[PDB]
Amino acid sequence: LDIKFAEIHPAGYPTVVAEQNMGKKLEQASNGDITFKMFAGGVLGSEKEVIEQAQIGAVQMTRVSLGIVGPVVPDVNVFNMPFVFRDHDHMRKIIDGEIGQEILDKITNSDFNLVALAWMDGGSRSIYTKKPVRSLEDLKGMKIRVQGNPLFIDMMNAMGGNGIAMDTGEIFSALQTGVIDGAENNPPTLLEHNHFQSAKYYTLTGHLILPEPVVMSKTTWNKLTPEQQVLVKKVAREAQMEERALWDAKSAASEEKLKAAGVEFITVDKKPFYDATASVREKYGAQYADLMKRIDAVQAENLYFQ
Numbered sequence: 001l002d003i004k005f006a007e008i009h010p011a012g013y014p015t016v017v018a019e020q021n022m023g024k025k026l027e028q029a030s031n032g033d034i035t036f037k038m039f040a041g042g043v044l045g046s047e048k049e050v051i052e053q054a055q056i057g058a059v060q061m062t063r064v065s066l067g068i069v070g071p072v073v074p075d076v077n078v079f080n081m082p083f084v085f086r087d088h089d090h091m092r093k094i095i096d097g098e099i100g101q102e103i104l105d106k107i108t109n110s111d112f113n114l115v116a117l118a119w120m121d122g123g124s125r126s127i128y129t130k131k132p133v134r135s136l137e138d139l140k141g142m143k144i145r146v147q148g149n150p151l152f153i154d155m156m157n158a159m160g161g162n163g164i165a166m167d168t169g170e171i172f173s174a175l176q177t178g179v180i181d182g183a184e185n186n187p188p189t190l191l192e193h194n195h196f197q198s199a200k201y202y203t204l205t206g207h208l209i210l211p212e213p214v215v216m217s218k219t220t221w222n223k224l225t226p227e228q229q230v231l232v233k234k235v236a237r238e239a240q241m242e243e244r245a246l247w248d249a250k251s252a253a254s255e256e257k258l259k260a261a262g263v264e265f266i267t268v269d270k271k272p273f274y275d276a277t278a279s280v281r282e283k284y285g286a287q288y289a290d291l292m293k294r295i296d297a298v299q300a301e302n303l304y305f306q
């Protein structure tokens with residue numbers, strides 16, 4: 001059984017490395033009965049195009065941002081809301097515990113032919129722009145690229161900007177020409193997708209912390225034996241933990257490289273951004289009241305139950 005794994009990120013990126021190591025484990029443990037090949041750098045298309053391919057079995061596995069899964073499986077949008085997690089460490093507790101399992105299961109048990117197996121870390125997303133944004137007010141009227149999810153367009157509009165949905169690969173040229181004034185992402189993406197060449201101001205809003213599911217086509221999943229399925233579950237969960245260490249290293253390295261390239265990291269009070277997005281959490285969070293209560297209550301400890 002052959003697995004093609006699609007990635008939007010370039011070779012060497014922390015997700016890519018963790019995933020190729022996971023694939024090596026699959027090959028070794030199955031004595032070659034499962035083979036694995038990585039297709040990085042967006043060679044198999046945009047994240048939305050790849051998810052479509054996974055649904056019909058043309059691509060066997062991928063990792064994508066949860067941001068673009070929302071339009072396919074609405075119930076995952078609980079993790080896509082602005083400031084749903086208080087910080088990066090809080091998100092990690094969630095994806096490692098019971099609520100993380102529940103949300104993976106909402107993808108798997110959906111009618112959309114995907115099996116969700118683990119969560120990769122993509123840090124926190126902050127706004128980078130061609131001109132400095134030092135306050136909520138400075139964002140007014142700016143065209144900021146977001147991922148293709150109505151939630152993020154509403155979010156950016158609530159912050160007084162103009163959210164423009166675009167595929168990952170379209171951002172570089174749109175920035176170069178001023179078709180957009182900025183975008184929002186973590187430091188490794190800002191660096192490794194070369195967006196810093198056009199945007200030298202990075203405002204640390206941390207407005208989203210979007211986990212990234214690793215998914216398999218359910219068509220492919222159903223061709224595995226139960227023992228192979230257990231192997232896949234095991235090594236996917238191991239990859240969630242391995243990628244965390246790679247992520248922390250890469251994020252810190254990327255921050256330093258970006259500063260050396262002349263990117264200014266601008267600290268801001270998050271409160272005005274939190275307040276501006278209350279309407280978005282009210283709109284999209286109405287049906288997630290219980291989950292939000294449970295998420296908010298995860299704090300000092302590291303329990304599984306939440």
Ligand SMILES: O=C(O)[C@H]1O[C@@H](O)[C@H](O)[C@@H](O)[C@@H]1O
Nearest residue numbers: 008047064065122147168189
């Ligand atoms: O915003 C984006 O397009 C990209 O953001 C990065 O942070 C994610 O790791 C990647 O999966 C997304 O495709």
